[PDB]
Design a protein around this ligand. Sequence first.
Ligand SMILES: *C(=O)[C@]1([C@@H](O)[C@@H]2C=CCCC2)NC(=O)[C@H](CC)[C@]1(C)O
Ligand SMILES: *C(=O)[C@]1([C@@H](O)[C@@H]2C=CCCC2)NC(=O)[C@H](CC)[C@]1(C)O
Ligand SMILES: *C(=O)[C@]1([C@@H](O)[C@@H]2C=CCCC2)NC(=O)[C@H](CC)[C@]1(C)O
Ligand SMILES: *C(=O)[C@]1([C@@H](O)[C@@H]2C=CCCC2)NC(=O)[C@H](CC)[C@]1(C)O
Ligand SMILES: *C(=O)[C@]1([C@@H](O)[C@@H]2C=CCCC2)NC(=O)[C@H](CC)[C@]1(C)O
Ligand SMILES: *C(=O)[C@]1([C@@H](O)[C@@H]2C=CCCC2)NC(=O)[C@H](CC)[C@]1(C)O
Ligand SMILES: *C(=O)[C@]1([C@@H](O)[C@@H]2C=CCCC2)NC(=O)[C@H](CC)[C@]1(C)O
Ligand SMILES: *C(=O)[C@]1([C@@H](O)[C@@H]2C=CCCC2)NC(=O)[C@H](CC)[C@]1(C)O
Lengths: 223, 222, 239, 222, 223, 222, 222, 222
Amino acid sequence: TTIVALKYPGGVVMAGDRRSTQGNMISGRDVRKVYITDDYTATGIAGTAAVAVEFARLYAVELEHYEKLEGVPLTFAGKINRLAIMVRGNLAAAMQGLLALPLLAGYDIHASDPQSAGRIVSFDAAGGWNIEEEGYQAVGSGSLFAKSSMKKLYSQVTDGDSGLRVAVEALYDAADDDSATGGPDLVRGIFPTAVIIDADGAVDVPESRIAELARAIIESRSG
Amino acid sequence: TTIVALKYPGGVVMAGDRRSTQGNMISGRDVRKVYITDDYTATGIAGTAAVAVEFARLYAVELEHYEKLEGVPLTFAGKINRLAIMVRGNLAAAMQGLLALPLLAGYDIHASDPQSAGRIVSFDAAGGWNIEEEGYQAVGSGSLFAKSSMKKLYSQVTDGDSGLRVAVEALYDAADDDSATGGPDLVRGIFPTAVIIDADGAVDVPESRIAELARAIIESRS
Amino acid sequence: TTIVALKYPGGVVMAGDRRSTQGNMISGRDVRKVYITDDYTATGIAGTAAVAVEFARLYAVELEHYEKLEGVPLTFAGKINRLAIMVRGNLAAAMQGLLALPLLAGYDIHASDPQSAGRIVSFDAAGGWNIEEEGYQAVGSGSLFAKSSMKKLYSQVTDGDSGLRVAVEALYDAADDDSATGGPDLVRGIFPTAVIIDADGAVDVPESRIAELARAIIESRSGADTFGSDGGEKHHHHH
Amino acid sequence: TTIVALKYPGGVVMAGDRRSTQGNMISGRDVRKVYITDDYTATGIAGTAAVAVEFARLYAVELEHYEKLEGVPLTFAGKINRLAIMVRGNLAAAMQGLLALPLLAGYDIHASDPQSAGRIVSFDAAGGWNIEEEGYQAVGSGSLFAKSSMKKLYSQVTDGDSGLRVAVEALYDAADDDSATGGPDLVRGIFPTAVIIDADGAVDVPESRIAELARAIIESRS
Amino acid sequence: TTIVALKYPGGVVMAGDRRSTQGNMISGRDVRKVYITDDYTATGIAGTAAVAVEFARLYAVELEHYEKLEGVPLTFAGKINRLAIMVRGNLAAAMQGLLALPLLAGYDIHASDPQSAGRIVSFDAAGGWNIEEEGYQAVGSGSLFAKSSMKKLYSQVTDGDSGLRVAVEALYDAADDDSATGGPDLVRGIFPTAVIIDADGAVDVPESRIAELARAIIESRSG
Amino acid sequence: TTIVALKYPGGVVMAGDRRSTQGNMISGRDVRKVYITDDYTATGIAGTAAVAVEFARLYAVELEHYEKLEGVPLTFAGKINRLAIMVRGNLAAAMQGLLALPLLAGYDIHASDPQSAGRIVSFDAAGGWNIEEEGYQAVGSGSLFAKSSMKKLYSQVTDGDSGLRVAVEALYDAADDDSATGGPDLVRGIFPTAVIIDADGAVDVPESRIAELARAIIESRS
Amino acid sequence: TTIVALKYPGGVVMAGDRRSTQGNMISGRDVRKVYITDDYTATGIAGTAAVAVEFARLYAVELEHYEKLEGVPLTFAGKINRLAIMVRGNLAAAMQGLLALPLLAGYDIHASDPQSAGRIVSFDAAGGWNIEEEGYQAVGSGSLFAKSSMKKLYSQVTDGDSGLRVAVEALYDAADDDSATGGPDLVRGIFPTAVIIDADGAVDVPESRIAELARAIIESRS
Amino acid sequence: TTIVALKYPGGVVMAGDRRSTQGNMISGRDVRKVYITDDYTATGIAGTAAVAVEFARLYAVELEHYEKLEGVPLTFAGKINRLAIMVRGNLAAAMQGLLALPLLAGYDIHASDPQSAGRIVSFDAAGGWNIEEEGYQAVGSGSLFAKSSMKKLYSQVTDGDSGLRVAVEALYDAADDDSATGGPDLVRGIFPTAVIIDADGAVDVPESRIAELARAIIESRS
Ligand SMILES: *C(=O)[C@]1([C@@H](O)[C@@H]2C=CCCC2)NC(=O)[C@H](CC)[C@]1(C)O
Ligand SMILES: *C(=O)[C@]1([C@@H](O)[C@@H]2C=CCCC2)NC(=O)[C@H](CC)[C@]1(C)O
Ligand SMILES: *C(=O)[C@]1([C@@H](O)[C@@H]2C=CCCC2)NC(=O)[C@H](CC)[C@]1(C)O
Ligand SMILES: *C(=O)[C@]1([C@@H](O)[C@@H]2C=CCCC2)NC(=O)[C@H](CC)[C@]1(C)O
Ligand SMILES: *C(=O)[C@]1([C@@H](O)[C@@H]2C=CCCC2)NC(=O)[C@H](CC)[C@]1(C)O
Ligand SMILES: *C(=O)[C@]1([C@@H](O)[C@@H]2C=CCCC2)NC(=O)[C@H](CC)[C@]1(C)O
Ligand SMILES: *C(=O)[C@]1([C@@H](O)[C@@H]2C=CCCC2)NC(=O)[C@H](CC)[C@]1(C)O
Ligand SMILES: *C(=O)[C@]1([C@@H](O)[C@@H]2C=CCCC2)NC(=O)[C@H](CC)[C@]1(C)O
């Protein structure tokens, strides 16, 4: 698994691979690992699928629940805290192998400066969180490969589209070096999924845009 | 890893993938796992990379050693026995994680009927061997996928070329389902290696022929 | 054990073998592993026999329970969630050798496009589920053999009968390679069971069509075996 | 695995199934488990395949080795003792999972009464042996089913052919109840192998004869 | 990690490095480990990030909670006891690898002599506390190097400014000998954080001030 | 520790960091980890220092020993085999926490094409070796960061100087992400060491050249 | 750690060292280990710092709590029992390494004979207590050294001042032989603390008096 | 234990504390840990006393043995290697708890520049050695304190006497923070021992010079 997230001027993008495995066996090729959790946030999760999925589903319900009860959404800091508490609650199970780690991306409508209102937050198994300041982050078995790739490509990020391209290329580098991360599948037409979030909210990136970027990356390296 | 071998009218073909890993990490993309061990035999090995390479190397030396000392090569049965003894000798080390399992393919110049002189032999960790009679075999983490694929494609094998095509497609199916087996890499131009053996001896299959077959398999599935 | 499920234009079919074992011993030859759980869904279970039967029985009760209480059946997504929660609830027991894994097949009456309303969903021990979209799935010790077989035969599925045939052939290939899966028993007349589900609902497939399909698969392999050889050599002859 | 042996008036018959497995997986369908070890004896072996084959191969060499060195074959009791010593020698390996148990069938040319010169001997992991006196014996995971079947069918053995039939039916019952034992495979035409030994020596039973008995048992149960 | 604290005439200073690691990997470069917990106290924490952060957050809430309920802030001794009880409460978890150890610095408004009203308190895993009487203390994997450095530099601490400079140099020595403690990062412009507390209260030291001190220390040792 | 090696047109460069640690403690700042082992080869080693230093020293003696005894140096393949055998010989100790892994760089004087005569070989704990074909390799705790960095920078390598620059930058990237790898120390004036090998032999890269490259990388990133 | 207590005509004195350690490291030099727990009692504690401090603090609160609620202080026997019960309550934690052992010294206002109203009570991990009647006692890693020293010096105790001198010299002897007990630190001017208790109540001994005695002991041994 | 060594213009000095312990108990106050091992070298050892003494004794014999046999002393590099091999030989025992680590100080008569001919070499449990390049080193439980102290005082070393003073002060700081290292004992008149080595050879520093330095350090800190 590999999930990446990066900030660009005016927003944030999060993308994830489609592979699921059982030991060495490829058991899934179209899993979606990045979810829009509310109008301004997306959650990507690595680790045990059952827990990962529950986290994303319960977390979206909890965010909207607060909103309906209180009339206003939680502040970004409050959203982070709720995710952290949810991860912390799974600590015992995690020690027993049901370990799941989310990566949170969002756009803070209340931030002072809009161009930098993008947010990336990582979490550890005990519920510790860290608001990323370096511009990008990644979780999963291919995360180190992805991060070392973004380290070299990040300077090319100037807007949402160059942001998305660097994210897809980082996932491509993760797949190139980590057999547990799925690369673009040209035969079946399956590609990484991605969410972009800016002042207008969180939106799924259309598969055809990702397909085009992936094919370009492949062609480019083919020579 | 996946190494396959299958028999076709007049000979045998053995093909192997190119991937090496360390845990989930892809650590190699061009490893050669199939070796010509003498004029009429090829060995493909799965398992611990260090042990596999050493088995193939020592085994070829042992075969030629006998030939130079005695003036004639070992009978095919003798070749099988030496490889089995070599595997048996690694049993202790294997239980400690140094396990390697070879797959042997050959053409028996002394067999009565030439069209069926092809031989495929598999081995277990204790040195047990079995001369295959169903037409094909495979070893490695992708072997079950490869064998289930060849079970459906084998009736198409009628000569060396259709044999080669089915072998490459079996490796393609193994890579499709086993993350530890490498599929054809069109970006880097790296494909499975293969050896064909018939009455004229063992010869490495040129990469261009495999690339061709691989692209046709991919085109067909898209 | 092997349970398979596959989608065909307009529906879905699920079929299961009949073997039960205790170690190497064959302890049962007529176990039924595929259940109609409601009018539009079937459940096939692999693993610990005791837990498997209980999951199917309790799940059917839970689906009907909701229907009687609320006046309407659960949406397909809700059916999936309930089965996932039930599996998750057995996680402790499963880590202690009581593990069971279900495979769910259904027809979604509320799906937009009827020809593809067929649904196949797999589950892992922790309750994780995945709606299958490659057309087929299988669970049990013979599942890898069944899936590799279906991978090569799936392009032949064009309707319910060809789908049934392919499912039976996949079970046949699983039994051919997995000693824990039972093949067709011609001496006793026992064959895999199957359920077909389409817009008119889930129905058990009659034993006689499955028996016919099975003998046809066997005669066909018998013929191919004689036609074939080992790179030219034939080591056995039928007599 | 299931190997059976039974005495009939004037000789003995030994038959074995063809299945090899690795966990639940069927890894082989034509394995031969019964060997003619010398002119008057056959050995069938169950357990670890590597070791089983070595035993049979080494044992035949040892019997013929004695014969060439001393000019005469070992007495039947001496043949038993050598086999026992070979099994005992594998005891450490066996406790480590490489356990193989042979079943020995023979015809004693030096026995006083020819009609009963047939011999069946079983062995345990420590090298203990027992000359069977009840008429039949079996080894392997399906042995209990085979023995209970022979217990009911043994009164039908009156000569070599009815003995061969009972042995095949015992293997059929073992496969019917033990998933590790292979039944007759009508699709592939593969059947249990058998060896018959009488005053004229040990001979392999032709496959066609076993196929016919197998079909009659199946028809009869159908 | 290294957190240092030292008393100077009239107050106290606490400074912390910015590194977070996962095994040998540097996983963070801008973590803040020193928090102002109330108007007159600061808490620096080493160990498990998740527990560390939760300690500081809950501790700040608990101190203000008492103040709002009772109308007056807790005495300094009461503040120490509350932190000790919180640490003790994590002992079972700590034995499971979730260990966190705080270092408390404060200014006691009720102390008789103002020049020495500065306070430094250390804590062990069982909730034991000790009010430091030798002028400085440190916690974390680089604490012994920091303390041995302050032992030689402490006589130079005559006021809050030289106290801040020494604190920075002790952290510099900790980073020089402990790979788990981060040194000043001149390329990215990231430096240790610090808090100064005197009769006017606790205040964050501006990063620019720390950067100047760090550059000066670096120039000096260069020759 | 991080040691990197990369091929450039006409040769090869190997560079290593200078840090040694004991747990979290920095215990050394000027360790040299890259050695010229003969006129055309360099060895860099990661792992337990006592064993690493021993391996480089013993290996250079072995290479020269052969040369003096036989009158000619070992072929490159033979040099690889000797290093592999030495590593294999330490396996028991390595499972005991004494593990050391070398990285070998060389220039093959007997290679057909001089521009590509550069060689990079990696080794695993069991003595398995692999001649690298992707152009670069790295060993040590910072190796993955270094390899990911070189993957993006490798296309800039057109000669020995750009090759050296990319190697230093890879080490810089390794130190930026791995606390166990030492970055350039501007205060003390200590920098990574490097060896360049081309048709004229292996020569140590002067510290001043490395220092200029390091400063340029630092200025570039700030 | 070392805490000593001894009876003198008319009262009792308790004194403790100032060292705290973490393994071999000296982590503290001014810890106070002897507390006045009520007007007529002092408690000194050895073992886990966290537990010892909590024992002294909770115990003082419990004694005064009883006094305020009931209007009169607990009898000396009651005070002993409360401390024993508190120690017993820590048993589980103590078996887990959180072990602390108190030493209690007091003056019993209700005793018949005032010259001997001094009391010293020791405690074990399970809450067992013992009223010491031999004149002195000590707890901590240096206690055996302190007791053997007091055994030889005790006959010199004739009043409060000589009692104080013997206590300080016993702590001196403990520090002389036990690296975990701190000696008088002349450089920093830190000395053992002490509490004296007689008919007028418990009072802290001024540091200057202890420093004086310590200097005299050192002069004497020089 | 703490043993320090530092280079000064023209030579080197090595000094060690005098304490030996058994658990928390001080079991010795006058142990000598620094030995002159030949005319130009001194060895200081920490760890298990039995093994430490054996090392110093055996090593001095080995150095002189070579000299008598070959007519010339070993080069400094050879002396290092011999000590390393001796340490490596104790690795199995060290794992079992008999761990001893030497620190080597010497003056290399064959060095090009005399003012810097001083040498300091440290060793790890596996026999790994490192020629110190930053001016000083220390071994033992108080070594980190001693090194952090020398890091601040080293710029004061300008000759043999200031180097000896700084070495004594570093040992004083080690004793101040490590209960296992002995400080100057003014009551008994026992101080750290030291060896100075320059072009004229290794000589023991007279106790009176060390006593004066120690008393001055103590008064200074008072
Ligand atoms: C990824 O972390 C991975 C996925 O299978 C899993 C599936 C769906 C969404 C959550 C992530 N988890 C694992 O355990 C695999 C094995 C290493 C995986 C492919 O990495
Ligand atoms: C295959 O068996 C595999 C290869 O890495 C290895 C490399 C070279 C030749 C021998 C075979 N061995 C392993 O351990 C991997 C993980 C399961 C592998 C990719 O399958
Ligand atoms: C299959 O999964 C299998 C069946 O015995 C069992 C029986 C009835 C319904 C649920 C499935 N379960 C087992 O434990 C056997 C051994 C691996 C089995 C035949 O596979
Ligand atoms: C039988 O004993 C069996 C055979 O696989 C084996 C193969 C060839 C000749 C010797 C016997 N051994 C096993 O381990 C299997 C599983 C228990 C087996 C099928 O019973
Ligand atoms: C420090 O103690 C350290 C920090 O990562 C951690 C991070 C943020 C605030 C609390 C302290 N904790 C650890 O576990 C690391 C291990 C080497 C650390 C760098 O020392
Ligand atoms: C590197 O591999 C490293 C070095 O300390 C060591 C020292 C000198 C030359 C050989 C390599 N070895 C280790 O054990 C450290 C910790 C993982 C190290 C810094 O990486
Ligand atoms: C003494 O018992 C000792 C002290 O550190 C401790 C500190 C303050 C008051 C209670 C006693 N406790 C220990 O664990 C040390 C090690 C043996 C100690 C110095 O003896
Ligand atoms: C020091 O290393 C130490 C000494 O007792 C010992 C004695 C004589 C010369 C060799 C060194 N070794 C130990 O085991 C003690 C306790 C940890 C010691 C005081 O440190």
